[PDB]
């Protein structure tokens, strides 16, 4: 027996705060978290305790420490089948990663509607609020490989598999409401431009390179999503704190056959929140698994990721009522024009057991719809429909990828398809064709109807010639970028300017930077000038005189496009660093932890070494990590209690912790003699907004700190951080 | 025409220093560089200038901007074969990454021996000092994915394909002289332990997690390579500044049939140099492609990576003369006991054209040997021989992987093997078997002989029973980790302590930390207490009294094991950051650059924005990057010339630049008023060793700076760094 006597090798099977227990496979951490899909996986889950070690053929291994050899210093024998099976399996572990969105993190959960939507769709999963649909959701970046970093500047994916009673519906979205391009035929061009460049395969997880900006500068249709990626949208705090969007106009179809245009949304109940650029970039070095970790740990803690499904609904007669085309996936529908109807709630409440078998092998595809939903002619969506079934053939080894457990429907599935590599289902049907008499034509077609009917496409009228031609209605590129720009707060605008300036600094060919500046001058002169100033470019007279694009349907902003304009802060599941000393004022600690607990905010106790310290009343305080070990990048706020401050007052790492947190606009709270640290961050004696200070950690000190955390970051601090060398 | 009129889109086809031009495919950058393998790839190289865009069937494409639809706002049509071919190719771009060493960077080059080695081996590539052998070399980390970061703490791979006249020889080594484990049968256990943990697939590119340290604690054979990995060996400065080793004892076979035991070495002619941990970790965030970039840029600059092949040679009759087993890959052969004999020089002088086609698809395998070499019974080598042919069947799609252009021999190859997926060669032989009469038995077997003979294995005596047993000669785990530790300078020892301490802090289950501390107590008590202390662990009385292991054949140390004990610095190809201000003293800059140029040291001119600044005498200075854009992490030294210092003196970034660089022990040089920056790094008025300072930049300011650079880092600065919040 190798486990510790005291059993401290095994995490408790109860929710616990981040860092309190080793993390574990989800069915071991949370065995009584169930849904129909998790239960259906029980046939393939395999345990391990008390079982003998075997070959894959079931033969018990006696010595798993040695190869078979002629003499104990002799050559290895070919007849060692135990070694060759174990090394063969190892040699073949890897499968191709996804072409795009290869980096991603996934969890199980469930969805439930708020009310029956049968007046507008016959989709069975939306028919009744007591209908519970298991989901599996994978969040992702786009560009980097599966071993790339999480907190890159990039678009994020947000893909949800709904295991419905009438089929799998995959809603395969991103975290911004448009895409970079108009027509699928250009996706390999755009993707190749953003991906590592082909001679030397650099850079990983980064859009800051010549070929990306070359393509943007030549394809103004990109500028709208490029605005989003240059904003703090591009660097979320957490997959729990970003929006999701289907991007395309789709159709809902009701029992009458009436079609409503719809765009899908997910609204994070934890609110919207992003990092700042310096913090995100540094975080790819300090913890490239930050988002994957924090999703896994939120679920372990019971901070379940929750999102509200929302529909923007446009009647069919309203197709041409806006000044942009509804089928143009570079255009958003402003919520001022078409509000988001709140339709249901999805809760992610269980991590997988095995990352490869459930996350790596999951296959999502937007063409996986169900009766009650239909497509539109959006020419980006149209070509997606081809790609996602094609790519699975090499990625997952063949056409039976729906038999891989995570991908199986939980409803019935029967048809006449047979064979293919690694076929699991053994068909007993005498017939493998229809029409057939020999099995009385089973399984049989089903006419469409209100419930449990076969799929029939909405009979849209198609009229035109066979052409490879972009719709003239798609040829407008600047008014949405502009609407986005003007809807941002002044600090969100500064961060956009900064993002463009940093990015274009990394473009080696200066003409490309200039051509991008030319584009920005078509969006907004203030933006173009501020980026230009940073690049050492001077606008021409011409550029200074480009007329701004028009408003969008009379809108000159929509605050729903900002992360922060309308407060939606939720502090539950956020995390605070508490910097310890070798004689902490216990009274400050009790007060801090109590107040954090009451709001569901977690804490991590930090020191100059691991082990424990002892507080003034003798309370033994276990240390979670060192200052350098768990940097301020990893928390939302920093609290420093009183006690023996001289212990840490000269510690470079302790000072730097506060300097880093301060630069990145995080709330900082200082009690008693911790206020000696005001000098490292240059705080005036009478204080400043966003630094909480008092004689001790009373009720008012904690309320102030938590009010700051609800506002996420201290934007007012921004002009002060230029001075700080950190 | 989209290219700019002035041709600034095209990099100069001539050697240029890093940053001076955009990087390019190697046959375009350096068309005049050639060797036999590069010439033989010419039949598959494809150009692009002046050619029409086509399908892969050779059909010219008219409109590559749109799908074929019925009306310009209509549905996409299934008859659009141009869309479907382009999207199909895109959808199937990826192949499985390598199971291990997935992250790697490769170049073309050549090898030449200094003299004929025919007295000791009949290997043709070693037979003639005029025989030049093309090579292809791939350097790699071990744990992370292909999209993981370069400057991780990990082992590095160093694999060389020699395209000889008698076959492909692959020398597939690492940058440490031993491996973690003794028998191949344990490779999947060890690799699963170091790899991201299977529930959540964390952490990437990192050995700092529970399962790695659990395995190490339970498998003391691992401690030797773990010592190496915890030292600064784990974080090389560049692939150009690390050692290479074959690890295993192999054999040389001469024309007489005499076997000589051999271990292979590569000596970096640019010397040995490593980062420090904080630098390396932060650099995975600031530039996760730093080593790939540095290798490609050195080659583009003509700073060709050079290495000297060396052999440790042991006569057959000395097999048992040492305290350790020569077949035990966890033991090193100290150079003090068996010197490295110089064999030849390898020069890497051309980057690939396409990273995927040449790098990602290269297949190296240590079983690819040639007459004049042979194996031994090292039971880790023995199992490697099975793995590398096996894994290629899935990674590269089948048994014809040697027909992928990069893998092809340049020498003849003919046999009776046929078919298989993506078969290129079209065999005209009437026979596909031997013996045959119908083609007069061609191609024919060839007897062994002194040159151009058939391969015959050396007839080593095998005697013993068929067992799965470890040789008892392998069961000693501590004496080599001890020799390594004692061979390290006091600063290298401190960095080892800090490596174990930081790693064990990331282990969640405290008992694992305690178990590893106990192992360290068996190696060296000082090492073990210094780690314990950092972990808040107290050694027991028993642990305090463990007798240390014996020295190795009378050796108390071997300085060849240290990176820095014996200086072997080389400044050629290193890089200096030059921090500019808005009115630089031009005579400072002229003197700085002239001195840098004479030693082949590169520069980058940094400022607070992109564009230009103008010097005191009116010289226009082009800026390469901003302070924040090209951090001190990426350079070897920082020099600040005089001028308008007030311009940058309260710049947070410019100050932090000197602080980061100071912390990481880099030479810093300050001229005239730039001396004001002494206050930011707390240098006394009279200065300190490792900060160069003067009224101006002469003669002798640059000789002192360049002398510091030859010594790589300022180790004596270490006790001073803790003071500074950076
Ligand atoms: C026709 C090509 C094509 C186009 C135009 C798009 N995609 Fe895509 N996308 C793929 C081809 C593709 C793919 C190659 O099929 C992937 C990678 C591997 C896979 O299973 O599907 C994929 C992956 C992928 C994933 C990862 C799913 C997962 O986590 O497993 C998401 C969220 C998206 N896509 C979302 C979108 C959105 C919102 C788009 C535009 C509105 C979009 N993609 C355009
Ligand atoms: C029994 C399995 C096994 C064992 C014991 C080892 N390896 Fe290995 N190694 C592989 C199985 C493997 C592999 C699975 O076959 C790889 C991955 C994919 C491939 O083509 O080869 C590989 C890749 C690989 C690469 C990258 C080659 C490239 O650039 O493509 C290097 C440098 C090494 N190995 C070096 C070593 C050294 C120096 C070892 C110990 C002395 C060693 N490996 C033990």
UniProtKB/Swiss-Prot annotation, chains A, B:
Superkingdom classification of source: Bacteria
Active site, renumbered: 101, 174
GO biological process terms held by the UniProt record: DNA damage response; hydrogen peroxide catabolic process; hyperosmotic response; response to oxidative stress
SMART domains on file: Catalase (SM01060)
Catalysed reactions, semicolon-separated: 2 H2O2 = O2 + 2 H2O
The keyword Ion transport is assigned to this record: no
Protein family: Belongs to the catalase family. HPII subfamily.
Protein name per the record: Catalase HPII
Organism lineage: Bacteria, Pseudomonadati, Pseudomonadota, Gammaproteobacteria, Enterobacterales
Gene designation per UniProt: katE
């Amino acid at each position: 027996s190798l486990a510790p006597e005291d059993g401290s090798h095994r995490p408790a099977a109860e929710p616990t705060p981040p860092g309190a227990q080793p993390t574990a496979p989800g069915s071991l951490k949370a065995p009584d978290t169930r849904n129909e899909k998790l239960n259906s996986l029980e046939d393939v889950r395999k345990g391990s305790e008390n079982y003998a070690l075997t070959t894959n053929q079931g033969v018990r291994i006696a010595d798993d420490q040695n190869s078979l050899r002629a003499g104990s210093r002799g050559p290895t024998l070919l007849e060692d089948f135990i070694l060759r099976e174990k090394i063969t399996h190892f040699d073949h572990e890897r499968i191709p990663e996804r072409i795009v969105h290869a980096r991603g993190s996934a969890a199980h959960g469930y969805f439930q509607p708020y009310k029956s939507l049968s007046d507008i769709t016959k989709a069975d999963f939306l028919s009744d609020p007591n209908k519970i649909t298991p989901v599996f959701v994978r969040f992702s970046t786009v560009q980097g490989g599966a071993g790339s970093a999480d907190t890159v500047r990039d678009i994020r994916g947000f893909a949800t598999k709904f295991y419905t009673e009438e089929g799998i519906f995959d809603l395969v979205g991103n975290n911004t409401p448009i895409f970079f391009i108009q027509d699928a035929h250009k996706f390999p061009d755009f993707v190749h431009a953003v991906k590592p460049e082909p001679h030397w395969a650099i850079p990983q997880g980064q859009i800051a390179h010549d070929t990306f900006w070359d393509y943007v500068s030549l394809q103004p249709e990109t500028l709208h999503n490029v605005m989003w990626a240059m904003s703090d949208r591009g660097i979320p705090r957490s997959y729990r704190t970003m929006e999701g969007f289907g991007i395309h106009t789709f159709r809902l179809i009701n029992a009458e056959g009436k079609a409503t245009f719809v765009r899908f949304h997910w609204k994070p109940l934890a609110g919207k929140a992003s990092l700042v650029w310096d913090e995100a970039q540094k975080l790819t070095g300090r913890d490239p698994d930050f988002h994957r970790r924090e999703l896994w740990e939120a679920i372990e803690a019971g901070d379940f990721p929750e999102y509200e499904l929302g529909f923007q609904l446009i009647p069919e007669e309203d197709e041409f009522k806006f000044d942009f085309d509804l089928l143009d996936p570079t255009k958003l529908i402003p919520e001022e024009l078409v509000p988001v109807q709140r339709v249901g709630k999805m809760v992610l409440n269980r991590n997988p057991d095995n990352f490869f078998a459930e996350n790596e092998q999951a296959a999502f595809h937007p063409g996986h719809i169900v009766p009650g939903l239909d497509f539109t002619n959006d020419p980006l969506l149209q070509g997606r429909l081809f790609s996602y079934t094609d790519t699975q053939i090499s990625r997952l080894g063949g056409p039976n990828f729906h038999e891989i457990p995570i991908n199986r429907p939980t409803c019935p599935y029967h048809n006449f398809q047979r064979d293919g590599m690694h076929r699991m289902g053994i068909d007993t049907n005498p017939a493998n064709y229809e029409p057939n008499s020999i099995n009385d034509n089973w399984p049989r077609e089903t006419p469409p109807g209100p419930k449990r009917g076969g799929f029939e496409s909405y009979q849209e009228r198609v009229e035109g010639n066979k052409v490879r031609e972009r719709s003239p209605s798609f040829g407008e590129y600047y008014s949405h970028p502009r609407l986005f720009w003007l809807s941002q707060t002044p600090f969100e605008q500064r961060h956009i300017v900064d993002g463009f300036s940093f990015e274009l600094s990394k473009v080696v060919r200066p003409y490309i930077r200039e051509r991008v500046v030319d584009q920005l001058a078509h969006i907004d002169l203030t933006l173009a000038q501020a980026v230009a100033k940073n690049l050492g470019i001077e606008l021409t007279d011409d550029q200074l005189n480009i007329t701004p694009p028009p408003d969008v349907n009379g809108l000159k902003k929509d605050p729903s496009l900002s992360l922060y304009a309308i407060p939606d802060g939720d502090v539950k599941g956020r995390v605070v660093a508490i910097l310890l000393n070798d004689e902490v004022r216990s009274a400050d600690l009790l007060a801090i932890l109590k107040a954090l607990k009451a709001k569901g905010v977690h804490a991590k106790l930090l020191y100059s070494r691991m082990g424990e310290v002892t507080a003034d009343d003798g309370t033994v305080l276990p240390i979670a990590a060192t200052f350098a070990g768990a940097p301020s990048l990893t928390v939302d706020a920093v609290i420093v209690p009183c006690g023996n401050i001289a212990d840490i007052a000269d510690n470079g790492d302790a000072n730097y912790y506060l300097m880093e947190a301060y630069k990145h606009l995080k709330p900082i709270a200082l009690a008693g003699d911790a206020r000696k640290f005001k000098a490292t961050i240059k705080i005036a004696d009478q204080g400043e907004e966003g630094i909480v200070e008092a004689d001790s950690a009373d009720g008012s000190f904690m309320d102030e700190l938590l009010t700051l955390m609800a506002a996420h970051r201290v934007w007012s601090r921004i002009p002060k951080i230029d001075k700080i060398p950190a």
